Short mmCIF file of C-alpha atoms and ligand atoms in Angstrom, two decimals:
data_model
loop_
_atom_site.label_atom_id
_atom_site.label_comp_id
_atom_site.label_asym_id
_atom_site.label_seq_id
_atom_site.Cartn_x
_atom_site.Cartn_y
_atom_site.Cartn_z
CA UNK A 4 23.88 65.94 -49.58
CA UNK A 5 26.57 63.78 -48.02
CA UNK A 6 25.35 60.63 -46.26
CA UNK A 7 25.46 59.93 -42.51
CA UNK A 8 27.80 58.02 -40.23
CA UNK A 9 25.87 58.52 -37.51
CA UNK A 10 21.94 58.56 -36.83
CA UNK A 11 19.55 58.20 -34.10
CA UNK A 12 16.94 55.78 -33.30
CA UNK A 13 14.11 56.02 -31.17
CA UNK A 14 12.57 52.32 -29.21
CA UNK A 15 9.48 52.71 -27.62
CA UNK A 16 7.62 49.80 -26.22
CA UNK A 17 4.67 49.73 -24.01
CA UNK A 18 1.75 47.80 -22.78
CA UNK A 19 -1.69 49.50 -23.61
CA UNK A 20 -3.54 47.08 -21.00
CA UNK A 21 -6.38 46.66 -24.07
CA UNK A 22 -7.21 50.56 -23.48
CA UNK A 23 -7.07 53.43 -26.15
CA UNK A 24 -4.70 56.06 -25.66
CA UNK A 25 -4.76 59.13 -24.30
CA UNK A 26 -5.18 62.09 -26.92
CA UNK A 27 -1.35 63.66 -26.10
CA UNK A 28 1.60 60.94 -25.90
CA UNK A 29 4.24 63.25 -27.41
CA UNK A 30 6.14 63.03 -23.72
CA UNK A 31 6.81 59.50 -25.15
CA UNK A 32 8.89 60.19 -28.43
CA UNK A 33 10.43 63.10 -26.38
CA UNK A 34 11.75 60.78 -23.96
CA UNK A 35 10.29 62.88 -20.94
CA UNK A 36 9.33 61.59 -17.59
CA UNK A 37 11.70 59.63 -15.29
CA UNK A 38 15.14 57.78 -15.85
CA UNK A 39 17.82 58.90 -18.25
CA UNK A 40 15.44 61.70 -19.78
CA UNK A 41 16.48 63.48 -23.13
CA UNK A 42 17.37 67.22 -22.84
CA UNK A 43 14.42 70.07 -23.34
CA UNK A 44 16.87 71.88 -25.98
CA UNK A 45 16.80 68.67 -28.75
CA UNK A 46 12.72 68.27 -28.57
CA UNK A 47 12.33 70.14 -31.98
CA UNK A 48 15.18 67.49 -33.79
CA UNK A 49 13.69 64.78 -35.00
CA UNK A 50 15.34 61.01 -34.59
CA UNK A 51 16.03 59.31 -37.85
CA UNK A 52 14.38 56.03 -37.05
CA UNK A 53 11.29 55.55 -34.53
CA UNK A 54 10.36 51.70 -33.43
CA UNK A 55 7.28 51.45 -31.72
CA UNK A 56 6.87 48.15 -30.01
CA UNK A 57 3.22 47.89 -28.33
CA UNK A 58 1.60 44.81 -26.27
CA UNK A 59 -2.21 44.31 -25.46
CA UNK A 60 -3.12 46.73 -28.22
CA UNK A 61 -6.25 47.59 -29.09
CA UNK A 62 -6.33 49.87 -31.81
CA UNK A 63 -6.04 48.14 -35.86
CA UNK A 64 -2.92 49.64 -37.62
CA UNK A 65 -4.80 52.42 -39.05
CA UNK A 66 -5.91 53.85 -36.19
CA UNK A 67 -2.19 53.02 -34.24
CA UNK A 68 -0.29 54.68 -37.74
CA UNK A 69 -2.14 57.90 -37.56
CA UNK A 70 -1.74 58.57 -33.89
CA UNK A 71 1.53 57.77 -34.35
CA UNK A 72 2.58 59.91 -37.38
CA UNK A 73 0.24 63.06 -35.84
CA UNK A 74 2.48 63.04 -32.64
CA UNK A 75 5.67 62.97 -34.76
CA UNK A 76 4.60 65.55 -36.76
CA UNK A 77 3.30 67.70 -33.83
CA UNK A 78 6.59 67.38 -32.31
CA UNK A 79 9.08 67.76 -34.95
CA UNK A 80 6.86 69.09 -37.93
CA UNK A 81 8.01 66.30 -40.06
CA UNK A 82 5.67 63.82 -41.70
CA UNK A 83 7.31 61.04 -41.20
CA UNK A 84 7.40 57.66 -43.72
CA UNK A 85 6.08 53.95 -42.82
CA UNK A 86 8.79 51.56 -43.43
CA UNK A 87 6.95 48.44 -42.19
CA UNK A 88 4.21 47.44 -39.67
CA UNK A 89 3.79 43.91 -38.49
CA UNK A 90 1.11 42.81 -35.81
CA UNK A 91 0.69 39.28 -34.29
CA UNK A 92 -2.41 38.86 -32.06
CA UNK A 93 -2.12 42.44 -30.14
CA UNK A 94 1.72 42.81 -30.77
CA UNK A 95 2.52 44.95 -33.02
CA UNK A 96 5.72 46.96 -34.06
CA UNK A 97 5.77 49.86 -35.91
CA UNK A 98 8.84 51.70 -37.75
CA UNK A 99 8.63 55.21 -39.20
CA UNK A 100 11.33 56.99 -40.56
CA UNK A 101 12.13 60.84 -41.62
CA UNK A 102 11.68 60.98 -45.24
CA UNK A 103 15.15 62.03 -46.24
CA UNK A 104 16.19 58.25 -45.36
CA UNK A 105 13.31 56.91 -47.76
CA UNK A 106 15.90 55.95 -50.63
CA UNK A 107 18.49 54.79 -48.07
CA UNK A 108 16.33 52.03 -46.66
CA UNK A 109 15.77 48.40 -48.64
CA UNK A 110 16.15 44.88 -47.71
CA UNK A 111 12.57 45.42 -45.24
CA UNK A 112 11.75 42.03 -43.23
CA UNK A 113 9.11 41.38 -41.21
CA UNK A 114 7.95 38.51 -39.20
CA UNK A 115 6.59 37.01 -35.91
CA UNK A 116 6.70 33.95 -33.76
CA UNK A 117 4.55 32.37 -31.51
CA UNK A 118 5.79 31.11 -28.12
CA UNK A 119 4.38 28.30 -26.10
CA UNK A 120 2.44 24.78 -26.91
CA UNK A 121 -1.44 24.57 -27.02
CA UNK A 122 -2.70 25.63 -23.84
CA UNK A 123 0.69 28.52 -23.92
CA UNK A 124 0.10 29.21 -27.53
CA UNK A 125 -2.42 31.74 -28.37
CA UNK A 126 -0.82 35.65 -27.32
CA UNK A 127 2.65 35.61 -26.47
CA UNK A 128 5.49 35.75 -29.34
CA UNK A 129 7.48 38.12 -30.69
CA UNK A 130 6.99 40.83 -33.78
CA UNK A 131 10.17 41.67 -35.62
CA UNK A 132 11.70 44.38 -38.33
CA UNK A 133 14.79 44.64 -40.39
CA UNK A 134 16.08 46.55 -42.82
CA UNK A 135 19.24 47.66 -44.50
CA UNK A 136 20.02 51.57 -43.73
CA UNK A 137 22.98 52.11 -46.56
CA UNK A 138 25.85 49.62 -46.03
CA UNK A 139 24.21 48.87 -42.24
CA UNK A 140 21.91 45.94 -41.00
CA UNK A 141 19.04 46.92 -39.12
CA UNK A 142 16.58 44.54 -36.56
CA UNK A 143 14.16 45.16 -33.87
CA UNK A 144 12.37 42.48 -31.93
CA UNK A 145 9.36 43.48 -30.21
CA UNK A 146 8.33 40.50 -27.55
CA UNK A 147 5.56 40.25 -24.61
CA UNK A 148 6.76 37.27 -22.74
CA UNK A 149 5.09 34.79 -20.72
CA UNK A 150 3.77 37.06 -17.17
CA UNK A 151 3.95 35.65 -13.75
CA UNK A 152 6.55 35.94 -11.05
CA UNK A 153 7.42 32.44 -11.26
CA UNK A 154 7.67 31.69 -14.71
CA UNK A 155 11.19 33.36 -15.26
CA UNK A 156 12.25 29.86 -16.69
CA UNK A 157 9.01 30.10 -19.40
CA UNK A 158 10.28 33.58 -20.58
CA UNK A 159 13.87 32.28 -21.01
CA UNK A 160 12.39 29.81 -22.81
CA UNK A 161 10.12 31.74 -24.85
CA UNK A 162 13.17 34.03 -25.13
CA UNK A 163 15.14 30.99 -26.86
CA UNK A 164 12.42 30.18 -29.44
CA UNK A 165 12.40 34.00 -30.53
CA UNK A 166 15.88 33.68 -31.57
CA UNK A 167 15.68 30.63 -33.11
CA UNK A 168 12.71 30.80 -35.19
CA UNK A 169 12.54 34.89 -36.25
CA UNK A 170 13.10 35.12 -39.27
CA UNK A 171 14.62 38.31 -40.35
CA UNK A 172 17.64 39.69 -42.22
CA UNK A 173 19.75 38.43 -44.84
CA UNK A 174 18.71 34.49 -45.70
CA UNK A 175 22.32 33.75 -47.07
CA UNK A 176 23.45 33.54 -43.32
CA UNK A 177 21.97 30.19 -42.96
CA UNK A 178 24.28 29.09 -39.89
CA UNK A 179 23.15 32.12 -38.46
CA UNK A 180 20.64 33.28 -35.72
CA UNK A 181 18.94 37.05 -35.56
CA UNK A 182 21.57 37.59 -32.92
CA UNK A 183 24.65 37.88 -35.20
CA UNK A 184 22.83 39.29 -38.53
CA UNK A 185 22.48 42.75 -37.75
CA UNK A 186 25.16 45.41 -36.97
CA UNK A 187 22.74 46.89 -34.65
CA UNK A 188 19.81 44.73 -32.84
CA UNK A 189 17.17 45.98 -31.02
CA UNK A 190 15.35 43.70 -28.79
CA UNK A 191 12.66 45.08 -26.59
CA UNK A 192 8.95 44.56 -25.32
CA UNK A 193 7.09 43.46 -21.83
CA UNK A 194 9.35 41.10 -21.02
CA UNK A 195 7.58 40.28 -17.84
CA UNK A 196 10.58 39.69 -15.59
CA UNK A 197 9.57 40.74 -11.78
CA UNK A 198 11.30 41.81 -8.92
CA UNK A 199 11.76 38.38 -6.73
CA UNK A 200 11.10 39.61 -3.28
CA UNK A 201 8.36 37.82 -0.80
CA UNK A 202 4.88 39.06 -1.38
CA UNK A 203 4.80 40.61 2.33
CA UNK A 204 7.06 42.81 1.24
CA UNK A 205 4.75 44.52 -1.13
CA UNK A 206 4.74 47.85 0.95
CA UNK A 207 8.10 47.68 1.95
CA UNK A 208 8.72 48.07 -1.83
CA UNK A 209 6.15 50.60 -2.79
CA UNK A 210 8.12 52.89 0.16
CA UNK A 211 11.00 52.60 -1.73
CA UNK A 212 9.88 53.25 -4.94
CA UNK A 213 8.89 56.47 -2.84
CA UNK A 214 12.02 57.44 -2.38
CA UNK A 215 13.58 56.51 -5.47
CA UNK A 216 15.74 53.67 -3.54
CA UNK A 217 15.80 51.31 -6.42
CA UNK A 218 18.93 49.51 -5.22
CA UNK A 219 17.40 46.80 -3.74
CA UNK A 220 15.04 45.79 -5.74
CA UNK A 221 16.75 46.00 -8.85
CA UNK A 222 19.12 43.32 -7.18
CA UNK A 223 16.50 41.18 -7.54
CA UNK A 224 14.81 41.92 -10.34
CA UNK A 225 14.92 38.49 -12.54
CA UNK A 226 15.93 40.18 -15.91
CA UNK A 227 19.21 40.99 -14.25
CA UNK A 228 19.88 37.84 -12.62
CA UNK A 229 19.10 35.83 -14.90
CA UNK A 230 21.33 37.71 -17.58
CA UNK A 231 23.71 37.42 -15.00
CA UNK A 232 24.26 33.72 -14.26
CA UNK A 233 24.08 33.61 -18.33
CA UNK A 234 20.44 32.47 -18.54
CA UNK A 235 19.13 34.47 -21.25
CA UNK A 236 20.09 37.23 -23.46
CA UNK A 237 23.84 36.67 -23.70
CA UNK A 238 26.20 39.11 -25.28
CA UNK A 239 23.12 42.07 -24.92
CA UNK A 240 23.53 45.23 -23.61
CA UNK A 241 20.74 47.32 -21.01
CA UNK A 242 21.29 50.95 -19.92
CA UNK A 243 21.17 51.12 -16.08
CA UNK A 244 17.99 51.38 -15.07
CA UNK A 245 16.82 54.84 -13.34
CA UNK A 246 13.48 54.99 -13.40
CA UNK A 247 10.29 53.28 -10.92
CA UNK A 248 8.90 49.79 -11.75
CA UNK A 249 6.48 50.72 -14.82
CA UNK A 250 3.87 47.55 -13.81
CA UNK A 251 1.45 47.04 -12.35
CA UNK A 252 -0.27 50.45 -11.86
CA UNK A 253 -4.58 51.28 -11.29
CA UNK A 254 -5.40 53.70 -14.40
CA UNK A 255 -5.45 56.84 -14.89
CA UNK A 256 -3.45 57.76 -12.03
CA UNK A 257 0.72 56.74 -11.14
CA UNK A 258 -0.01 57.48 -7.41
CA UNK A 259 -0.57 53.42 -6.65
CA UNK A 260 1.07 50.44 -7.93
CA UNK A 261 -1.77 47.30 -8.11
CA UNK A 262 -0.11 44.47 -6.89
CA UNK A 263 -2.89 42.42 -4.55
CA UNK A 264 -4.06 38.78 -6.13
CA UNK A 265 -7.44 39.35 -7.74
CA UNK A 266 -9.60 37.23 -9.73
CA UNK A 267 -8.74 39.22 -12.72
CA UNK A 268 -5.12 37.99 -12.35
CA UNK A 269 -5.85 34.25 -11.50
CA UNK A 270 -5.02 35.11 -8.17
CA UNK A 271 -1.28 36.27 -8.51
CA UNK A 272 0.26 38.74 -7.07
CA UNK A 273 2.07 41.74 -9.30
CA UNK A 274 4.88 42.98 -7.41
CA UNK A 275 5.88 46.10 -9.00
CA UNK A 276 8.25 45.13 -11.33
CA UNK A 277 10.28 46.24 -14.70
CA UNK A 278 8.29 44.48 -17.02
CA UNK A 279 9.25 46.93 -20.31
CA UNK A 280 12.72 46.60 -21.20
CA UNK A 281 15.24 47.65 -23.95
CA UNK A 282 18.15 45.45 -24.78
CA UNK A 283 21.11 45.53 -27.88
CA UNK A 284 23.60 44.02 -29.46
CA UNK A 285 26.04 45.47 -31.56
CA UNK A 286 28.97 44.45 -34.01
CA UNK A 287 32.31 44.64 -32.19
CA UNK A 288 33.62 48.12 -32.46
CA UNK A 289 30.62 49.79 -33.63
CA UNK A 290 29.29 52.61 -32.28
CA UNK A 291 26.04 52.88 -29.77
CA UNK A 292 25.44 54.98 -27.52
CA UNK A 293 21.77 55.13 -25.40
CA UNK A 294 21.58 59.14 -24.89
CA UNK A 295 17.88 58.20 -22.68
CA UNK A 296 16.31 55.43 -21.02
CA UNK A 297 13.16 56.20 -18.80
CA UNK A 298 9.30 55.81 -18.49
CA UNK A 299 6.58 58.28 -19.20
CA UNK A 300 5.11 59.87 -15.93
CA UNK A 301 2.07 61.51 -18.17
CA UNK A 302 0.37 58.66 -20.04
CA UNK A 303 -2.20 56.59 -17.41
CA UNK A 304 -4.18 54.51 -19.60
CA UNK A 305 -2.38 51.46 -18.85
CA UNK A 306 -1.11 49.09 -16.01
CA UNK A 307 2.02 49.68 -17.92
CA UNK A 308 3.75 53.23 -18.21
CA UNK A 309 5.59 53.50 -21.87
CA UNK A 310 9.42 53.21 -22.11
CA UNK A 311 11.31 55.15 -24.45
CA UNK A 312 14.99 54.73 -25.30
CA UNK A 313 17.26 56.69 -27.63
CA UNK A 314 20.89 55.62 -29.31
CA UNK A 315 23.67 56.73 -31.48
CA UNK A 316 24.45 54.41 -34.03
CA UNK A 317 27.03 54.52 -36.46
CA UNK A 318 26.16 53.68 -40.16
CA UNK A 319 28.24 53.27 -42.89
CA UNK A 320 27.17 54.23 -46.75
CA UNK A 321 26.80 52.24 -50.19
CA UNK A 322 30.69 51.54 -51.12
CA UNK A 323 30.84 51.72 -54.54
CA UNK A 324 34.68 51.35 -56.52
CA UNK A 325 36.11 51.18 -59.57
CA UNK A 326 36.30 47.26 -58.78
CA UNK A 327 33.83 45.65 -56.13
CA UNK A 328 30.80 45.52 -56.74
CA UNK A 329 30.64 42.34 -59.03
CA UNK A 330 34.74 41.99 -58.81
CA UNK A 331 37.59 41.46 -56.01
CA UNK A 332 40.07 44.24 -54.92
CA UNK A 333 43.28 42.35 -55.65
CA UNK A 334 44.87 45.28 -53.47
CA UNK A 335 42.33 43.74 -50.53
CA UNK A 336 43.09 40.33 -48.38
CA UNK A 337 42.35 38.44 -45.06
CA UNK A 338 44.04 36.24 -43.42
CA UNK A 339 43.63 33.91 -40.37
CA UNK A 340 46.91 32.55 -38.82
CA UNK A 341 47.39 30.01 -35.44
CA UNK A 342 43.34 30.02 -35.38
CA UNK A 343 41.60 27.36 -33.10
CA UNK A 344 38.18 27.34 -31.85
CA UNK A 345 37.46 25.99 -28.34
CA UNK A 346 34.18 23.48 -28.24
CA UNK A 347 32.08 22.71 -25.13
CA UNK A 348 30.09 19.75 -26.98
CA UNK A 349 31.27 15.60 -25.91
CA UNK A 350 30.80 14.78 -30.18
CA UNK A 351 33.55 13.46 -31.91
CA UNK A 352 32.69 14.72 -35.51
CA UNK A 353 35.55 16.48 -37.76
CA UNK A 354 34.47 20.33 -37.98
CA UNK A 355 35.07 23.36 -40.73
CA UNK A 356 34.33 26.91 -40.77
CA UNK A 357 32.81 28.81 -42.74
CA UNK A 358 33.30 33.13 -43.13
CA UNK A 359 30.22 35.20 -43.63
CA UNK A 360 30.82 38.47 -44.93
CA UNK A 361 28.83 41.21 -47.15
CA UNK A 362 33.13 42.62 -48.01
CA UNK A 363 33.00 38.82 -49.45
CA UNK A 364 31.49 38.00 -53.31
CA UNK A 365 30.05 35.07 -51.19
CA UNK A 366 30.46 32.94 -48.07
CA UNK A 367 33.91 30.86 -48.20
CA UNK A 368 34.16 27.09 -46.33
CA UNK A 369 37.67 26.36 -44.73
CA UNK A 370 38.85 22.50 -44.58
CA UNK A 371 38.93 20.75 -41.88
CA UNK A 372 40.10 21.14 -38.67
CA UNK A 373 43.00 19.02 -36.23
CA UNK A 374 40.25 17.94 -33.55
CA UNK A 375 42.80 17.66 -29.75
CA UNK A 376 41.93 17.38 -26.25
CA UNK A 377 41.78 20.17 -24.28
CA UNK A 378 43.59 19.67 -20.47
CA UNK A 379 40.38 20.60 -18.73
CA UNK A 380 38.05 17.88 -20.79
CA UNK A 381 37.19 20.55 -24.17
CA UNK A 382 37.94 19.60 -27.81
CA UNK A 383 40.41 22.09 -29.31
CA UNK A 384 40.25 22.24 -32.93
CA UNK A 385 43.26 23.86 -35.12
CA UNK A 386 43.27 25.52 -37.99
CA UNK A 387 46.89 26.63 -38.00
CA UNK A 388 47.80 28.39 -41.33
CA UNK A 389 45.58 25.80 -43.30
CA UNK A 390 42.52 28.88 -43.15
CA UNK A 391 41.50 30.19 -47.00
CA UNK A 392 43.14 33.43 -47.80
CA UNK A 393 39.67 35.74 -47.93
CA UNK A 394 39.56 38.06 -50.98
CA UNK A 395 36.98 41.24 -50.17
CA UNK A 396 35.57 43.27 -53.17
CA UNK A 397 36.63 46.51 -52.01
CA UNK A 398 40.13 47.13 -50.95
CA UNK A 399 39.94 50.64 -49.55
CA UNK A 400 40.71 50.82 -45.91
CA UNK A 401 37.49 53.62 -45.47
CA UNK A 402 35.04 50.99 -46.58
CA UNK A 403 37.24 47.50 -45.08
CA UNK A 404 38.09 48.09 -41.66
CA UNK A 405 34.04 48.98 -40.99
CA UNK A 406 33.53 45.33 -41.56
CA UNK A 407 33.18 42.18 -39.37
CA UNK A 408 32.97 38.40 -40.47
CA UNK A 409 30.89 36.22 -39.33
CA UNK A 410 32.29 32.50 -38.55
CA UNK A 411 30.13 29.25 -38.04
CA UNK A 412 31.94 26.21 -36.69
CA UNK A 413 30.02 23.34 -38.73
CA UNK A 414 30.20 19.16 -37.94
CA UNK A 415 31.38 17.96 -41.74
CA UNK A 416 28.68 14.95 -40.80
CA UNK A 417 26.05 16.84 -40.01
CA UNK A 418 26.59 20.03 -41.33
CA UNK A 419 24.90 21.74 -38.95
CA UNK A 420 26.08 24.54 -37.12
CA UNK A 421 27.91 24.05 -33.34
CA UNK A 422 28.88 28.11 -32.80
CA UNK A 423 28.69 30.83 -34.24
CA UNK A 424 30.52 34.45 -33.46
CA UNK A 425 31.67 37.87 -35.44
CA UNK A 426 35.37 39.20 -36.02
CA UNK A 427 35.23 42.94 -36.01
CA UNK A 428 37.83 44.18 -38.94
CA UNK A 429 38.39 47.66 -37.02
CA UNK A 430 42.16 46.87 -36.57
CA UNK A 431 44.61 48.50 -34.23
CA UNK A 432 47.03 47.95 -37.70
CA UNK A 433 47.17 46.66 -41.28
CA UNK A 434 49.51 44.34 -42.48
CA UNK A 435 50.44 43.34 -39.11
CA UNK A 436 49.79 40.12 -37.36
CA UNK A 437 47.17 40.88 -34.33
CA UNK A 438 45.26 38.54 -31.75
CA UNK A 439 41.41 38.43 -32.50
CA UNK A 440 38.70 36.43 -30.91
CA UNK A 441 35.14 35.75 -30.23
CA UNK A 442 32.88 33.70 -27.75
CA UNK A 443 31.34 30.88 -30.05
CA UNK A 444 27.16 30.53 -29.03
CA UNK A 445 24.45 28.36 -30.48
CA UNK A 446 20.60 28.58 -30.27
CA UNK A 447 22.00 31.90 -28.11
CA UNK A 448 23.60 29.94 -25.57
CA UNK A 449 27.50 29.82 -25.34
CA UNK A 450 29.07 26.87 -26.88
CA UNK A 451 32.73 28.00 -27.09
CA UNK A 452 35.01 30.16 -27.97
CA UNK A 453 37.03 30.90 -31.69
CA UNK A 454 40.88 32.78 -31.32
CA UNK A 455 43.94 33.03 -32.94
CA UNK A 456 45.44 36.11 -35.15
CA UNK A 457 44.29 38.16 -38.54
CA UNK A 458 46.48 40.26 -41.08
CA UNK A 459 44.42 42.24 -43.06
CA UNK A 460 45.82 44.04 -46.12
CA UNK A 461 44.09 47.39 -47.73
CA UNK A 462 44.93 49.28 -50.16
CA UNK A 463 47.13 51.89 -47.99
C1 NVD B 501 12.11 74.79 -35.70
N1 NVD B 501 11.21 73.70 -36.04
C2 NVD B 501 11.43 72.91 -37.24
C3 NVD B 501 10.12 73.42 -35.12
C4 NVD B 501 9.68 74.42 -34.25
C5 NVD B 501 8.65 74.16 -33.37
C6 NVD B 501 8.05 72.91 -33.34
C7 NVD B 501 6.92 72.63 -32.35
N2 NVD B 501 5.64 73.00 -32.90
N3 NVD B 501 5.33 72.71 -34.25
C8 NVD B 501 4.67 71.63 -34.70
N4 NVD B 501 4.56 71.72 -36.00
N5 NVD B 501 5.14 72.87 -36.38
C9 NVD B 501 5.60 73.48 -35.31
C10 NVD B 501 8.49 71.91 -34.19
C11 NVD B 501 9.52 72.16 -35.08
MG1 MG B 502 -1.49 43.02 -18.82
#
């Protein structure tokens, strides 16, 4: 039974607005309703991976798990495997995945953060998964941000602390954030960005919504903007969006969006809005591809309509060789020529790098850098051809060139971490002298900017 290069993963996230379900939600996991929708002739194949990300839920994990697994297995006939659940408050994600793939998944993570300070801490945070699938990192962030039209600056924040603080993935990349540990990252959730338009215009937007006009309110819808001017969730991807504003709807109906101050909402107004979202982030050069992005039209128990989107994503399997693991490939080398990283900070510190790889035995540290100024105000520090020849464990071209590095910029007084960015190893040419580059971030936020040129040698 040969192993995959491809699979297919389901995200799901949606608000349950503290009700039950409904007894049928299979037009969920079939990606069914409005948007990118998933054609009628692939309902029978099951995906490989399904992430269920809820908010306000009611139900315990039990109850959630079976409704979940009897929906699968309605659909698909397959009974499908828990690989982790992990609920903070009422935010919970769940993964499930077809039992062929039981023996291909290790490495599970879970864990959660809590956003906010005292009077802001108690139900917002963030649940998150990873896992290894064969030779590929895994993680999935499920989030319900801070609500309110005008608290787009709280969610970026709240955005900043999940990707700081989640703790997921493979420990050994200390210098490294949940945004560069995975070759595929799923972040999704209610998100609770709204579309800024004045209040008054309420009915002018429901009338559009009518019509399926969504080009001027997404213009303003704060998710994009903000991702925009480079506010939050740098370097992630979003399918365009297709589909009506999924909050704030009356129950058990989608004929009216709910969007006049009441007590019950402290007196805000709820626009209708995009609140449920679902962002990536790949590797360089790996492929993902969303094949649907929508809402359910069906499922009315909630103020929130479910979103469902499906990807490609290439995997790669177990390399095992004669050599690596537990050895180098002599045959196998990396190297770094005319490298210099590009710094936004005002410090003054001497910096190093340091190359994070899983082709590596373990991480390697360079020496340090020539710190310059820049002619625009920057430090500019070289590398030249001073960089540590890196010595994978496989040399095989099959398994090497699926790779990336990882690269933190460190302060040799501090040792802490100033940018961090990935290298994909998916070459144009081996033995051959080609430009490479990444943007540098920190804490998510961009910091600078790491080029020069790599030769890599396999062994073809
Ligand atoms: C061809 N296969 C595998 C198939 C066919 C029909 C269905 C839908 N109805 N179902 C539910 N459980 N068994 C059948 C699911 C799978
Ligand atoms: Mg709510």
């Amino acid at each position: 039974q040969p192993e995959p290069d491809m699979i297919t993963i389901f995200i799901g996230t949606w608000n349950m607005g503290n009700a039950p379900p409904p007894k049928k939600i299979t037009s969920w996991f079939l990606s069914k309703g409005q948007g990118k929708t998933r054609d009628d002739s692939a309902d029978y194949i099951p995906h490989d991976i399904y992430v269920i990300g809820t908010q306000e839920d009611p139900l315990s994990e039990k109850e959630w798990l079976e409704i979940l697994k009897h929906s699968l297995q309605e659909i698909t006939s397959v009974t499908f495997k828990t690989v982790a659940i992990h609920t903070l408050w009422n935010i919970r994600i769940v993964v499930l995945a077809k039992p062929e793939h039981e023996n291909r998944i290790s490495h599970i993570c879970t864990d959660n953060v809590k956003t906010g300070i005292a009077n802001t801490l108690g139900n917002k945070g963030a649940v998150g998964v990873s896992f290894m699938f064969n030779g590929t990192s895994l993680g999935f962030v499920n989030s319900h941000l801070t609500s309110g039209s005008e608290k787009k600056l709280r969610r970026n924040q709240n955005y900043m602390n999940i990707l700081r603080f989640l703790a997921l993935g493979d420990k050994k990349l200390s210098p490294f954030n949940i945004t560069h540990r995975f070759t595929h990252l799923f972040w999704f959730g209610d998100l609770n960005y709204r579309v800024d338009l004045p209040t008054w215009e309420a009915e002018t937007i429901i009338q559009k919504i009518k019509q399926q006009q969504y080009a001027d309110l997404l213009s303003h819808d704060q998710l994009l903007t903000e991702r925009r001017e480079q506010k939050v969730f740098l370097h992630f991807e979003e399918e365009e969006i297709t589909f009506a504003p999924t909050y704030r709807f009356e129950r058990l109906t989608r004929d009216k969006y709910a969007y006049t101050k009441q007590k019950a909402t402290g007196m805000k107004y709820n626009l209708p809005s995009w609140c449920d979202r679902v962002l990536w982030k790949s590797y360089p050069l790996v492929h993902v591809v969303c094949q649907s992005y929508g809402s359910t039209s069906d499922i009315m128990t909630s103020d929130h309509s479910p979103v469902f989107a499906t990807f490609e994503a290439g995997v790669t399997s177990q390399f095992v060789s004669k050599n690596g693991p537990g050895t180098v490939d002599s045959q196998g080398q990396i190297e770094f020529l005319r490298c210099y990283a590009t710094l936004k900070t005002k410090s003054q510190t001497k910096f190093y790098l340091e190359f994070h790889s899983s082709c590596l035995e373990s991480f390697v540290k360079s020496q340090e850098g020539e710190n310059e100024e820049g002619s625009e105000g920057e430090l500019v520090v070289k590398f030249g051809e001073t960089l540590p020849k890196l010595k994978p464990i496989i040399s095989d071209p099959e398994y090497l060139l699926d790779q990336h590095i990882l690269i933190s910029i460190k302060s040799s007084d501090s040792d802490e971490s100033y940018g961090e960015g990935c290298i994909a190893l998916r070459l144009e040419a081996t033995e051959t002298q080609l430009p490479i580059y990444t943007p540098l971030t920190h804490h998510g936020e961009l910091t600078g900017h790491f080029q020069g040129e790599i030769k890599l040698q396999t062994s073809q």
